[PDB]
Symmetry: C2
Subunit: 311 residues, 2 copies
């Protein structure tokens, strides 16, 4: 794992601060923060208003989130600056106390990128609860957002993360995912081949618990009652990871979490709607963004927009 | 299954006609029409603009579509009136020549409901090519759209379709679906248990051809290169069904169909975006629409808005 000083941010702190919001609180003075990191093509409220914002509130947290512009479609390394800055801020703002991080989709990749390349936050993140994270990207053009390139399997970014040690958990981590995910694949093996899998992680493939007939998609992986039970377990556990004893067959409910209002359940079902729209309307290019200098040593030989990464 | 006279429409014909559009042609005078029936929470153009409209155009058809208001969220029985009327009108408008129906999602349920309960179109539909149809609805709502009620497994509508013999093919039918469909389940068995399966149909579960490792979603079931090859097979086939010799493992590309222009591939992935939005902003009720008298005998004992379904 990389060590020593954090790399410099490409953005000034003021820009990164602008991406962070807490519910009814400022990041500098907040009780029991939980940092929520959104999915591709979404803002924090778009990913989480219908699910983990109100669910984490009922568990006694103050939900906070980042919304890197535009809708997480920009370079993943920049999205990660928002997350690293947010941890530094929320840690300092909650009495120098560790805080949990809860993510969806690209949000997990961002969290793990942050923990891999910015050592200062390793002591500040209590645990990670990632829903449908794509640490290996996805195998599922020239019409793609910067972060979609980086989330493509075999990308320079995913290569760098793996070579820097980022496929092993860095803090206590729970990963919840589905073999049937229609966005992130491969996920079928219930093993280290899966994109959501981290070594030493509590890797919960829904089919392993619920059976080989069980089906939930990419959005359900975040919003389901099953996901809530696993999520709650992870957040509550004294080990930092979800505990097998806290869930089972009877929790295998693929539909939106029971504690959500009827309105929130409908909105949770529609989770991927603004994401597709933002991708259609968003930035697109025909190459993968260059790696920042701190990441380049870990993907030598990969091709990005400027050319081949050199030693 | 039902035999005899078509039931009467609840909607005026002119209202039904207004929901029907053909590309660069009037339904009254069209050559080589294909009737496209959209998914829940979409219009015809929203379901097919980025896929089967230009692909059927490139295969030598005039794409026509119904867009039952509002966005296929109304009673599925009313949506079917649009389809049945469109068949009658497109059959007449093409010089009394049979036409193929191509569907996504609820559109397939609509097609089969039509063929089940309106006998006159049975002789007018050449074939059905249904992508991710939900004939048994889905196991995946007190504020839900009328058609969302009806597409829930165990609904009075799905009960009525089944008991009227509608889970057996009526015209030559191909059903292309995926075990991993995130909207329509169950689809996992490669067998009659699957929501997309019709007896005697050409039932193509993606994983049966592409392996148990193959994953494709509800939208991809319509838009993919794999789906295009299977669809092209069904349309061109002399039997009215897709032929196994026309596709294989090398066609197992889950990404948007190759022939599509670069902008059409982009919009293909965003297929469910208007759908999920319209569901939020459309009609909603706390009960399943009542079955129209022609369908009611097949779901006696079920519950709809007016209460328990009883014999007429």
């Amino acid at each position: 794992l990389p060590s020593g000083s954090d790399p410099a941010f490409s953005q000034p702190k003021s820009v990164l601060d602008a991406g962070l919001t807490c519910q009814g609180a400022s990041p500098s003075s907040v009780s029991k923060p939980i940092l929520l990191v959104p999915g591709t093509g979404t803002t924090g409220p778009q990913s989480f208003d219908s699910n983990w914002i109100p669910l984490s509130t009922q568990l006694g947290y103050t939900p906070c989130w980042i919304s890197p512009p535009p809708f997480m479609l920009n370079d993943t390394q920049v999205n990660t600056e928002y997350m690293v800055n947010a941890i530094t801020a929320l840690y300092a703002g909650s009495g120098n106390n560790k805080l949990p991080v809860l993510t969806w989709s690209q949000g997990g990749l961002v969290a793990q990128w942050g923990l891999t390349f910015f050592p200062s936050i390793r002591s500040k993140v209590d645990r990670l609860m990632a829903f449908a994270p794509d640490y290996k990207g996805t195998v599922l053009l020239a019409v793609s957002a910067p972060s979609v390139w980086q989330q493509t399997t075999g990308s320079a970014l995913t290569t760098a993360l793996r070579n820097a040690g980022g496929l092993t958990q860095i803090v206590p981590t729970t990963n919840l995912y589905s073999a049937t995910d229609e966005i992130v694949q491969p996920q079928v093996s219930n093993s280290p081949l899966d994109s959501s899998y981290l070594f030493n992680g509590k890797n919960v493939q829904a089919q392993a618990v619920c059976g080989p007939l069980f089906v939930i998609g990419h959005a359900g992986s975040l919003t389901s009652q099953f996901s809530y039970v696993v999520g709650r377990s992870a957040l509550r556990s004294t080990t930092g990871q979800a505990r097998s004893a806290d869930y089972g067959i009877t929790d295998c409910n693929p539909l939106p979490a029971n504690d959500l209002t009827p309105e929130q359940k409908v909105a949770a079902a529609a989770l991927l709607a603004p994401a597709a729209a933002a991708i259609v309307a968003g930035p697109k290019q025909n190459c993968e963004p260059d790696l920042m200098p701190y990441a380049r040593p870990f993907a030598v030989g990969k091709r990005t927009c400027s050319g081949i990464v050199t030693p």
